[PDB]
Design a protein around this nucleic acid. Structure first.
Ligand SMILES: [Mg+2]
Ligand SMILES: [Mg+2]
Ligand SMILES: [Mg+2]
Length: 95
RNA sequence: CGGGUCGAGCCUAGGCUCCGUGAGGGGGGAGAAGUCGUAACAAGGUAGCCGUAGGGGAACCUACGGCUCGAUCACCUCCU
């Protein structure tokens, strides 16, 4: 079929509202809480993360409130390709 | 029982000091995929810096008197 990072293991999905900066990414997840993410040492070179962008993140189990870690960003090729299959519906990005 | 005298302890009021919490405030140090400019370094595009005073979102701008730890050309002056 295809190779995409689905929710496999303990991943999350991350769509930020506004970046406070300095690494911390502020995401409006549908988990319920306001979450704040940080970046590992491999992806601060080739890519670009902005508000209006959907990515997959990975949390740590602490406090289930403010978690997340960037492990993969989504391209203009797959962001809306993950729509018809309904793995995410876009009613949680503007309303 | 009376007389004198040594006395720790206790109370009240006044002068100083120590310590755990502290509404509100102020700078300091690490973090650098947040923001606004370009002040320094070449004559860094207005030469840079010291003292004192006024001004400005912020680096900073201006006035008077000093220094060279200032670049280029032309003419002098003083030497080797
Ligand atoms: Mg400058
Ligand atoms: Mg200048
Ligand atoms: Mg003098």
């Amino acid at each position: 079929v295809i190779r995409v990072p689905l929710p496999e293991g303990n991943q999350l999905f991350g769509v930020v509202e506004q970046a406070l900066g300095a690494g911390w990414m502020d995401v409006r997840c549908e988990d319920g809480k306001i979450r704040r993410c940080r970046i590992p040492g491999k992806l601060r070179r080739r890519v670009w993360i902005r508000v209006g962008d959907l990515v997959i993140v990975q949390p740590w189990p602490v406090q289930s409130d403010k978690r997340g870690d960037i492990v993969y960003r989504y391209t203009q090729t797959q962001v809306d390709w993950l729509l018809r299959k309904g793995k995410i519906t876009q009613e949680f990005l503007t309303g």
